[PDB]
Each structure stands twice: as structure tokens, then as C-alpha cells.
Amino acid sequence: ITGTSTVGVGRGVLGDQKNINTTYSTYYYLQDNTRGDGIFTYDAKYRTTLPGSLWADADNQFFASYDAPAVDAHYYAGVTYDYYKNVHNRLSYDGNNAAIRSSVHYSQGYNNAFWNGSEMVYGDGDGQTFIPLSGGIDVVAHELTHAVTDYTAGLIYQNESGAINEAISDIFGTLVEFYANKNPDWEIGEDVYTPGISGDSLRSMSDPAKYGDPDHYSKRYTGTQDNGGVHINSGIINKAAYLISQGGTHYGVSVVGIGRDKLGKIFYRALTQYLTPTSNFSQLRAAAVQSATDLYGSTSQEVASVKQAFDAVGVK
Ligand SMILES: O=C(O)[C@H](CCc1ccccc1)CC1(C(=O)N[C@@H](Cc2c[nH]c3ccccc23)C(=O)O)CCCC1
Ligand SMILES: [Ca+2]
Ligand SMILES: [Ca+2]
Ligand SMILES: [Ca+2]
Ligand SMILES: [Ca+2]
Ligand SMILES: [Zn+2]
């Protein structure tokens, strides 16, 4: 829409109050004009037809429960845009300020979220397994990171390259969560998963095996489900990334941690300069060592920590 930029107030999925950027033109729309070419949030109205209607509201107050998922999808996309821009100098997902679009209320009881090659899409959850998926800042950032990858390395979504694609999204979704300082951890989707059970998540980066995912290359899933286990084998990369940042001894290999900023930056450079659609784990190791080299010098600790971490998980 064409209108006047304004600020509204609402409540997210978890009950927290936030300000959101809106546009005024008869109605108040979920259209944020302060970020690149815009952030836009749509109502899919429990249907599967995308994107749905641009979200319209009469009074600029989004306190209704049906409003919750839209508040969070809109707000978290902003934070994620901010992260890339401020931290990595990247303007939107394509590096050229593309508009960011999300739809909420997709389908009925849909326990998932996804990037469809053009926009983000969020289900409401069935109310037991998940609550509306846009309430998790790591989920929102994992999704927007698929768009970043699509525009950069272009990692094919299957087998090793697909598990690298997944680790990327979990790594950057976790860095966005620490960035916003919203109770940060090294778990994925804890805020929206099993509202009933406290303490769990979808996946663990710190200990992938907690939920049965591999944490060593020797334990790689070699079958065909999940596109050749893109959501499984990502645990091997995730654990490497956790060790680079935090440190530790894993399978007898000791890794000194270099912290999360440095982790973000080595991975961002590997992603944007070195990785290709068909990269495998072993190529991701060469890419990460080369980025850390570029950045900190050959005889650095940073380079050393990258090598140890990949040796710790069995990659090369
Ligand atoms: O982006 C992704 O990688 C996942 C998108 C998967 C998707 C792909 C194509 C069509 C529809 C859905 C969505 C997320 C994911 O990891 N989904 C997993 C785990 C999961 C979520 N809900 C589920 C319900 C059933 C089974 C698995 C799941 C999966 O689809 O495997 C990312 C973080 C939050 C949800
Ligand atoms: Ca209202
Ligand atoms: Ca958290
Ligand atoms: Ca998390
Ligand atoms: Ca839970
Ligand atoms: Zn994903």
C-alpha cells in the first residue's frame, strides 16, 4: 500500500507487548516501510492459498488472539533484517533490499513453517505439539536464512548439501536469538514446541544426540527419508558450530571456543564466498578453514579452533 508510516502496539504469541511498524491508509496495515523495500505480513485465513490478504486492522492495536502470530512474524522479521544489516552488512536476503513477506494462519492446525522460494509461511500449530510457529525468533530467522542461502551458495536441499543448508539456518537462527537477547540458548524452537512440556525443543546444537540426531560423522543417517536426512545430519554441523563458539572436548578432541561473533563471521563468509550448490561436509570444512584464514591469518587460534571442531565431529 501507499500511506503514512506509523507505529502500532500489540501482543505476541507468548503474551509479550511490542511496538510494530505499520502503514496508515484508511486501515492500518502490517507494512513496515523503514526496512529496505518493506516488510509485509499477510493473513492466510486458515487457507493454503498464498499469500492471502495484507494484514489490515482498524485501530493500530493488535491485542486480539488472532492478531498474535501476525505481530510476531512482522516484528521478528524486522529483527532478523536488522541482524543481517548491522552485523553482516547485508541488505535483506538478496543483498539488494528485497521486500520480506510472511503469511500467518496457514491451513488449520498446521504444525510447521517454511520458505516457499518467495515468502515465509507459518502454521498455527495444533495447540499441543506446537503453538503458532512465528512466536519463536529462532524459527523466523531459520526461515529467512533459507532465503539468504538460496541467493548465495544455493545449497541443493538434499543429502550433505541439504544438511549444510539446514545447519546454516539453525546456526543463524540461534545467532539472531542471541542478537535479540530474547532468553538465548543453543536449542531450536523451544519457545513454540510442546507448550505442555517444559525443557524440550526440536533440536539441540549443544547436544544433538539428546533428540537422537548424530553428533559425529560416523553416525550419519544414510537413508532416504527427510530428503536424505537434511534435518538429521545437520546435527553433525551444528555440533561443530557449537564447539567453535563455546569450546569443549568431544569424542576425546579438545576445542578452544572463539565465541559467537567470530562463529557468525566465519560462517557468513564461507556461505557468501566459498560454498556452492553441491558442497559436501568435507568441502564445508575447507570453506570454513579458508574463511577463518582470510579473516584471522593462517597461524591463528581461530583457524586452529575451526580445524579441531571439524576433527571433533569426524569431518576429514
Ligand atoms: O524450514 C524447515 O527446515 C522446516 C520446513 C519443512 C518444510 C519443507 C517443505 C514443505 C513443508 C515444510 C521447518 C522447521 C523444521 O525444522 N521442521 C522440521 C521439524 C518439525 C517441525 N514440525 C514437524 C512436524 C512433523 C515432523 C517434523 C517436524 C521438519 O519439517 O522435519 C524449521 C524450524 C521450525 C520448523
Ligand atoms: Ca485492532
Ligand atoms: Ca530461547
Ligand atoms: Ca532457541
Ligand atoms: Ca515444550
Ligand atoms: Zn530449514
Side-chain angles (χ1 to χ4, degrees):
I1 68 149
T2 287
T4 169
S5 309
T6 66
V7 183
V9 59
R11 194 133 54 216
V13 170
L14 279 25
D16 54 321
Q17 178 166 332
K18 29 212 78 171
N19 293 312
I20 41 208
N21 290 113
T22 60
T23 292
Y24 176 71
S25 191
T26 305
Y27 286 94
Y28 297 89
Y29 295 87
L30 298 179
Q31 172 183 142
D32 171 3
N33 317 109
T34 68
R35 287 181 172 101
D37 296 334
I39 295 169
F40 297 90
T41 304
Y42 297 79
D43 184 17
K45 310 167 149 158
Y46 309 130
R47 314 284 289 187
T48 56
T49 279
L50 293 174
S53 293
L54 181 75
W55 195 289
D57 186 83
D59 67 357
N60 220 20
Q61 300 204 85
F62 300 85
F63 298 103
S65 76
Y66 187 84
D67 297 340
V71 172
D72 292 333
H74 197 63
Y75 181 101
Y76 294 146
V79 177
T80 307
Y81 174 92
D82 293 350
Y83 169 81
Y84 276 106
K85 175 166 145 302
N86 289 341
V87 178
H88 300 291
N89 242 287
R90 186 190 183 74
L91 306 181
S92 199
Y93 62 83
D94 73 334
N96 224 330
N97 270 149
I100 297 170
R101 296 177 208 279
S102 296
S103 296
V104 302
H105 299 309
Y106 175 85
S107 200
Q108 300 187 18
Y110 188 68
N111 282 317
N112 225 342
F114 54 99
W115 169 255
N116 78 345
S118 306
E119 55 159 299
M120 292 180 279
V121 184
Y122 301 94
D124 293 319
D126 53 22
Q128 229 204 12
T129 309
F130 275 97
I131 59 175
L133 283 83
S134 66
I137 186 178
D138 56 358
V139 199
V140 171
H142 173 115
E143 302 304 342
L144 214 252
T145 309
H146 274 312
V148 175
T149 299
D150 283 357
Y151 281 82
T152 59
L155 292 153
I156 291 161
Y157 204 61
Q158 74 173 352
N159 306 319
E160 285 187 22
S161 63
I164 289 157
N165 188 318
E166 275 305 300
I168 284 160
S169 279
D170 285 343
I171 287 157
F172 288 107
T174 286
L175 296 176
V176 179
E177 184 174 314
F178 268 104
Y179 174 84
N181 207 29
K182 196 257 186 141
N183 308 293
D185 39 66
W186 289 93
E187 314 280 301
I188 309 290
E190 64 289 346
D191 286 332
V192 292
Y193 187 58
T194 58
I197 139 57
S198 177
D200 61 343
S201 66
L202 249 29
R203 286 189 278 288
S204 175
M205 298 174 66
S206 60
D207 188 6
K210 163 179 194 166
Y211 304 112
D213 294 327
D215 59 1
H216 195 281
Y217 196 62
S218 74
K219 311 190 170 188
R220 218 187 328 141
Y221 169 69
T222 58
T224 64
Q225 64 169 291
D226 183 36
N227 290 125
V230 311
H231 304 93
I232 306 178
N233 294 330
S234 55
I236 305 160
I237 306 317
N238 286 343
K239 182 74 184 189
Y242 176 75
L243 286 170
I244 293 165
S245 182
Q246 299 309 110
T249 298
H250 177 56
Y251 300 96
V253 181
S254 306
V255 190
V256 191
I258 61 170
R260 81 188 126 81
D261 258 33
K262 291 162 178 193
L263 169 70
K265 96 224 335 165
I266 286 164
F267 274 75
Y268 186 81
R269 181 166 184 90
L271 176 65
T272 57
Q273 320 267 2
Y274 292 114
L275 295 178
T276 75
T278 241
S279 287
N280 59 213
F281 287 10
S282 138
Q283 292 165 320
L284 170 73
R285 181 190 168 117
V289 166
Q290 184 62 243
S291 308
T293 287
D294 286 356
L295 296 164
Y296 308 102
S298 200
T299 74
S300 55
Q301 171 73 253
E302 291 89 357
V303 162
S305 298
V306 173
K307 287 165 315 192
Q308 268 310 83
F310 280 96
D311 287 344
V313 302
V315 181
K316 301 143 91 202

